[PDB]
Amino acid sequence: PKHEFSVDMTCGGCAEAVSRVLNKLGGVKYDIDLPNKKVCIESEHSMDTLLATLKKTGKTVSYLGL
Ligand SMILES: [Pt+2]
């Protein structure tokens, strides 16, 4: 499935932090829209796991749906 999340990223370092947590999780194809504070993830990970992973950055995260 393809999931979209809102992630409260401020700048380049925030975009890097999101990339780092997702790279560590593995098994993800993602793209990060820093200006619009959005992250899109194609994966067979559960939405739960992806939400928990993004939250490791400490940024506010919510789910924008499939
Ligand atoms: Pt930042």
Swiss-Prot record:
Residues 1-62 form the HMA domain. It comes from the Eukaryota. Keywords: Acetylation, Chaperone, Copper, Copper transport, Ion transport, Metal-binding, Phosphoprotein, Transport. SUPFAM superfamilies: HMA, heavy metal-associated domain. The modification Phosphoserine is found at residue 46. GO terms for cellular component: cytosol. One of its GO terms (molecular function) is copper-dependent protein binding. Cu cation binds at residues 11, 14. Homodimer. Interacts with ATP7B. Interacts with ATP7A. Interacts (via dimer form) with SLC31A1 (via C-terminal domain); this interaction improves ATOX1 stability and controls intracellular Cu(I) levels. Binds and deliver cytosolic copper to the copper ATPase proteins. May be important in cellular antioxidant defense. The heavy-metal-associated domain (HMA) coordinates a Cu(+) ion via the cysteine residues within the CXXC motif. The transfer of Cu(+) ion from ATOX1 to ATP7A involves the formation of a three-coordinate Cu(+)-bridged heterodimer where the metal is shared between the two metal binding sites of ATOX1 and ATP7A. The Cu(+) ion appears to switch between two coordination modes, forming two links with one protein and one with the other. Cisplatin, a chemotherapeutic drug, can bind the CXXC motif and hinder the release of Cu(+) ion. Belongs to the ATX1 family. This is Copper transport protein ATOX1. It comes from Homo sapiens. The gene is ATOX1.
